[PDB]
Design a protein around this ligand. Structure first.
Ligand SMILES: CO[C@@H]1[C@@H](OC(N)=O)[C@@H](O)[C@H](Oc2ccc3c(O)c(NC(=O)c4ccc(O)c(CC=C(C)C)c4)c(=O)oc3c2C)OC1(C)C
Ligand SMILES: Nc1ncnc2c1ncn2[C@@H]1O[C@H](COP(=O)(O)OP(=O)(O)O)[C@@H](O)[C@H]1O
Ligand SMILES: [Mg+2]
Length: 234
């Protein structure tokens, strides 16, 4: 399956923070959207996920233009999303965090949701945290719960907004292995970072964004030799 954004644009108070951005991510690849803080990476995700109204552009899955669908209807079409900052429910257990999403899985019985919650906890190595409150977890543990919670919806694409932020060095390694596993599972993974070299290594290809504009696309090796990328990071 293919997720495509075309000619996205967004302005705040007359300032165009995203302008004419197009990108695509297919099942089974990790695609980066990388660039400085304030370049418009999150705004682009917001428009793809449906969180803020776009000023221009289209969001498409395969042959379906879903531009008019709100966030939760786009989710049913397969779009998953990891917010940039904490989004775990801070005073709900890890288990109840998973069940907040598993409760919308109409394809599952009571027992099957419990099974699926248990499988997700094993898969993401959080089963020792079942009754722990979200607030009581480290940044890395919270991150694993947040990713498991998005997967409870069974998305086809997952947009990871700076998944390494606020996570200690050891947990970063674990999140990287999670990302590879999500890709091996058939998800198209779109990931943002401002630290280009580190995240670039885990991408099959990446778009580079600067001041709301796409300036380059390529494999990591092409990006690191791209003259437009270079004249931006002089
Ligand atoms: C399956 O996920 C669902 C979502 O559904 C979809 N389709 O994504 C949606 O139903 C809901 O989505 C939420 C639910 C809660 C937050 C949430 O709590 C977030 N965090 C913040 O808003 C936030 C986090 C830190 C921070 O310093 C500030 C600044 C604002 C202040 C202090 C007022 C804000 C956030 O960005 O996204 C959130 C989102 C996307 O709950 C999920 C995540 C279980
Ligand atoms: N609601 C808003 N009102 C005004 N400016 C905003 C709003 N949301 C984001 N911005 C600004 O738009 C620019 C792009 O932000 P953002 O997409 O979050 O960047 P990043 O690339 O760091 O994810 C920044 O200058 C940010 O402060
Ligand atoms: Mg951001």
């Amino acid at each position: 399956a293919t997720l495509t954004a075309k000619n996205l644009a967004k302005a705040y108070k007359g300032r165009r923070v995203v302008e004419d951005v197009s990108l695509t991510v297919n099942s089974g690849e990790i695609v980066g959207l990388l660039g400085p803080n304030g370049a418009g990476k999150t705004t682009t995700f917001y428009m793809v996920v449906g969180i803020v109204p776009r000023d221009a552009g289209n969001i498409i899955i395969d042959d379906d233009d879903i531009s008019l669908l709100p966030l939760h209807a786009r989710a049913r079409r397969g779009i998953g999303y990891l917010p940039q900052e904490a989004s775990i429910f801070r005073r709900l257990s890890v288990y109840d965090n998973l069940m907040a999403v598993l409760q919308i899985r109409d394809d599952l019985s009571a027992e099957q949701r419990e099974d699926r919650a248990n499988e997700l906890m094993e898969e993401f190595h959080i089963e020792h945290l079942r009754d722990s409150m979200g607030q009581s977890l480290s940044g890395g543990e919270r991150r694993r719960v947040e990713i498991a919670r998005a997967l409870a919806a069974n998305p086809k694409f997952i947009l990871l907004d700076e998944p390494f932020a606020g996570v200690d060095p050891i947990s970063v390694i674990d999140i990287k292995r999670i990302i590879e596993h999500l890709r091996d599972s058939g998800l198209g993974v779109l990931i943002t970072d401002h630290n280009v070299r580190e995240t670039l290594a885990v991408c099959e290809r990446a778009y580079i964004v600067s001041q709301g504009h796409l300036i380059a696309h390529g494999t990591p090796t092409e990006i690191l030799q791209d003259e437009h990328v270079k004249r931006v990071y002089l």
